[PDB]
Amino acid sequence: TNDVHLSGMSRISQAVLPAGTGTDGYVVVDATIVPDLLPRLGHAARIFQRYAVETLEFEIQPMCPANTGGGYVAGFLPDPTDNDHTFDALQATRGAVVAKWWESRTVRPQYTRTLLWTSSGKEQRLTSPGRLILLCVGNNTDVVNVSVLCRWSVRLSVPSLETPEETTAPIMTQGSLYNDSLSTNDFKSILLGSTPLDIAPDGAVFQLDRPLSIDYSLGTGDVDRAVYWHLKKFAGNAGTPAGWFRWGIWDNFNKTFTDGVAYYSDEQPRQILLPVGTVCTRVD
Amino acid sequence: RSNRTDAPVSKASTVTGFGRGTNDVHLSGMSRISQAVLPAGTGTDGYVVVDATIVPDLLPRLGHAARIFQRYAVETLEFEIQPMCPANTGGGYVAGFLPDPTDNDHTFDALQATRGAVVAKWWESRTVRPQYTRTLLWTSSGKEQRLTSPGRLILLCVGNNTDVVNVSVLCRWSVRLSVPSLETPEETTAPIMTQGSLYNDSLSTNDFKSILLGSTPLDIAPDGAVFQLDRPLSIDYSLGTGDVDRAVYWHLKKFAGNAGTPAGWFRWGIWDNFNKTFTDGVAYYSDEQPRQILLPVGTVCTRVD
Amino acid sequence: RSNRTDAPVSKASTVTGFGRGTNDVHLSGMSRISQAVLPAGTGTDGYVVVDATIVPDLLPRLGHAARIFQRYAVETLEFEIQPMCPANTGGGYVAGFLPDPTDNDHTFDALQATRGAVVAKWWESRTVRPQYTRTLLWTSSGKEQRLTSPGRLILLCVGNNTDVVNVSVLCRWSVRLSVPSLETPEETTAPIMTQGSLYNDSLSTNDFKSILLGSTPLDIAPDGAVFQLDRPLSIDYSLGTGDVDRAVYWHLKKFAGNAGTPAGWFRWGIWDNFNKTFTDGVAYYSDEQPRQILLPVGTVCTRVD
Amino acid sequence: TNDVHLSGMSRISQAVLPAGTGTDGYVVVDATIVPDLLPRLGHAARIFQRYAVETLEFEIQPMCPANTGGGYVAGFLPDPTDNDHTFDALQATRGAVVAKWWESRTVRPQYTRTLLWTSSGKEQRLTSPGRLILLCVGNNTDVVNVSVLCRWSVRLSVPSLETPEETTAPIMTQGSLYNDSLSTNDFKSILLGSTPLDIAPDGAVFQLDRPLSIDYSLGTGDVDRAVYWHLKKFAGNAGTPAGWFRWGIWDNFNKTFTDGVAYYSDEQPRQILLPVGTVCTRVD
Amino acid sequence: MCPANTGGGYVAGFLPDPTDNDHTFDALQATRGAVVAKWWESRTVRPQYTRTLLWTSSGKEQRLTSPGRLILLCVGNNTDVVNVSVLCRWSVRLSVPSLETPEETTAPIMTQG
Amino acid sequence: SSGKEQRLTSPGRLILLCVGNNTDVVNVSVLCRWSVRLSVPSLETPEETTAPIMTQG
Amino acid sequence: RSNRTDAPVSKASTVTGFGRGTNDVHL
Ligand SMILES: [Ca+2]
Ligand SMILES: [Ca+2]
Ligand SMILES: [Ca+2]
Ligand SMILES: [Ca+2]
Ligand SMILES: [Ca+2]
Ligand SMILES: [Ca+2]
């Protein structure tokens, strides 16, 4: 037949968290479970179209000293469209655990056995069984390094080859970007408020469904609203891990980025340039 | 007694009863989907009386209980249309349940074709026992309605109603919720689309009528129900010396409707979640702009609040 | 076939499936009643960490399901206090569940007396299995809390906490709702009382701090949560030539709290239900008024919205 | 039961390839298999809601003269939203065949036997089983006439009745239109770079979900964007068989086309009006 | 060998391919039997290894003279100095008697730089 | 994965000789129908699967 | 599952298979 059964253990994500930045409600890991996350499955979902998760079992492995104060609540929201980052959402879902930082727990979640499309699509519920969310319960005393290991057993089918761009997971911004909030040539990703975007590697150029509408100067007062789409991550400094996002153009074939005009800084009435739900996808 | 346990650096967390909520709740009941009052002579053939998508938000008790679950599966759906008019009332109604939530068509043939549809005089009640899928649909809203709705009900006037007719489309629902979770009470509603089109020159200085948008729920919305535009609304105005900035608003809400137009009037503005407040922008001022369409047909309107 | 039925003047209504909703729903689950962060050296003996009345509004899933019923009866209540601090933390906590919702007392003796109370070091968890009545309590709010609440939980610092302590008071609840009905989502909350007193000369020109009212829920309220005063608030101002009118406001809400006072500041105003809007009155202006008390101790504050 | 097993042959599409236009990776045929390309299934899917594909066997009939040595590769992508038009993606898919223009081959792909819907929706993944793609390997010495036969055995269900427009299929742009390279009153489909848009019949109008900002002059070096949501298609010429698209207000209520307003293309900053991934839907 | 206050983690694996010279977390974790653990916790790697009669003496290809290689990697950032020992339990079954020279019995090494 | 000898990494090599000169440019495409049987799960780097070349002159 | 083990100052060394080589070899 063509139901290749591939199963293995792999790490979806790893996060380093400094001391004193673990206020309750902070999102350490917010990872949508698509095959692109898992390495071995990532190299095996590009040669198949449809997969069915038959066994999923996350295990959180933090590596911090025993004499540390702080907890981590971990859960698996079965709805990928759900974007709740509160303790209530996790405590509601089955399989959630809470434990001290030096502890390693196992999350036995509630997923769906239905066939799912490896390739990304408009309506996410056909492409992911859910999202894993790990929150701090209290302020951490020291730096904590956490690795969310994942044990999976999928059943791929429908042979086909996919570009690496297609298999990337799209993440919607959690915040609203306002016109007065912009800087001269970029903006911090804290305004977006999405942890996957915050921890995105530097240079990961994204494309935004919502048209970023920066006004460009007409010379004397007159305002014309330019529309720019492509955004590039710019490395987060020590003070601000969020990095920055310079607007512009990312050529598909040429793989080259462009920097747009400086934000039109004047008495413009406040507008929503990018509301919550602004999908960003790695074109790189 | 036991006193031989040494004191370690830290003790294992003992939060055992966690993530063990009940999964299955076989909720049931009956409720009124819609109620309409057809004036005499206005029930011309083809007029749509009730056009209601059956999502777990129309049903009130289910609406307040689908927010504590994620996936429901309809197990018994049986609509019961009840008119209230004397036997002297002349005219007929056809009732059906399209199993496709995206099938937005209003004709006698489309309704009659579907299994379980009924045709009856206005002075006679009926029961629509329709065909509905048992698959685990999703409670929360999504891009596609077909995964979040068993179907929609349509009621049409067959003849010409002689007198005013009061019709109530009751529904009997027996759902089986599952997959425990805590959905947010907003973003649990149903997306709505603009059947009509909104023009730049169809805008007033500050407001704009909902009947232009062509969607009945937009025409009847309580004050304070702030809607969300997926597509940007680029209002025109004079920022300075005729500075026509395409001010982008995504947030539309129904201020106190104008008495002249019962369908009422939206404003464009900022709906801040951190403040949960609606702040209005610069009033529309068409200075020098060729005619254009701002909100095209199909612009999805979901109510942020 | 049957065709022998004559046509009467009107036919009997055939709405049979009416008023037949399910009555019993054995809802269950676990949730977090409260979570507190005690700073070092501020956990002096007698300080109240958690003081929470257990109404079906603290429990979220029950809160969204007690609005579709009227009378619930608690069948299993077992609070599970969980601290999170290393073994080097010095100090102790006492936890209890007063079965009398009106018993507003915070002492070690009162807590320890009640059955099921526990005393333990801050680095050790406990389980409070309390005594609770099985009588059919009422979901909706009323004049007396004793018919709408099994009791209240109190947590107290026994010693002096050496370091900051993060404590979470979890609760396991297994209620049995009954008497189907559709309670309004507002007026389902719990009434709150002003432990402190609000003076005429303790009022600013426009605002007044919540910490003066002496009630913690009043001190921490989201912006837009409009409260109701059972007792009138007679603000003073100069209507004309020093016209000191005792302007009566019953509606108090928390505008954006002042950064200086985290407890924040209410305004007096009109909360119109027909518009669902807060309109502010004339700013307070103490022109010539001897000192007085406007909102005395025990003024019930229920949130209209 | 209500199942109706219809089965019959039909010609998916007819394509004309001008002499010498067979550039590298040129898409001769890009046809989504919706129940309209098949005429009998087109008339028989208007009376049902759910259809499941039980058999699908394509066949190429290149009527190109045997003198031309240009090559063709044929494949069936099982993902309707898949916008990959590369040789590797085709050849990986089951049943893909490569030959020359004087040779005719068949395609027997691996479809998905699930209950698709017969009416258009937000995502195509529940409405179509896939899409036939036929690339031209090398340039053609002679004009290539291509006819692709289909052998389908669907299994309809859920009786109903629908409208003709409800069975239509959306289109996606494979290229990024640029402001600096734009005709004043129109533009050809070469900028869009989508084969269905290349062969788009004259009279069809496509709605851009992205803001179609046409930047008309306010005067004195000041310009203003004008947002539109329609694209009327006009026939082009022999030199450029791509055609033309003009913006404006295709007011379907009046069925009148406001022509493309003047585009003041003098100093517009380099932007992409429609970045890669922009979609177009024939309003009809 | 470090106290419980040591912060950091290690991943251990046994690549069955002696020529696979790659050092990443994913490559190690993929192989069967790999472990991930904090620095203050021991582990046992029970790996997959071929039973074929490998050759003792060195040759052109290592794949006929080695069951595989072991890799140990630092997952986090070690807070203090950590002393790690990679013990091994082996039960071989020698055969084909002969007298190999003691030199040319060692293992070839390659210049990465 | 690549090694010192190709005899444990590949099953063989396709060779296609041209018997005589071509009057026209010859475009050749060689299709393969393979049914492999993988085992021993792991993960590798792209370069490790490359193949060496030998000079015939 | 077992999660009731507290975290001590240090854990006992678990090097069990030590000093257990074969003694007799009839070469
Ligand atoms: Ca795909
Ligand atoms: Ca949801
Ligand atoms: Ca009541
Ligand atoms: Ca349909
Ligand atoms: Ca040898
Ligand atoms: Ca290898």
Author numbering:
A (entry chain B), D (entry chain A): 52 to 335
B (entry chain C), C (entry chain C): 31 to 335
E (entry chain C): 114 to 226
F (entry chain A): 170 to 226
G (entry chain C): 31 to 57
What's written in the study?
Nervous necrosis virus (NNV), a simple nonenveloped virus in the genus of betanodavirus, infects fish and damages aquaculture worldwide. The structure of GNNV VLP unveils GNNV capsid is a T = 3 icosahedral particle with a diameter of ∼35 nm and delineates the CP as consisting of three domains: an N-terminal arm, a shell domain (S-domain), and a protrusion domain (P-domain). The S-domain comprises an eight-stranded β-sheet to form a canonical “jelly-roll” structure as the building unit of virus capsid; three P-domains from contiguous CPs in one asymmetric unit are located outside of the capsid, presenting a protrusion at the quasi-3-fold axis. NNV uses protrusions to bind to common receptors of sialic acids on the host cell surface to initiate its entry via the endocytic pathway.
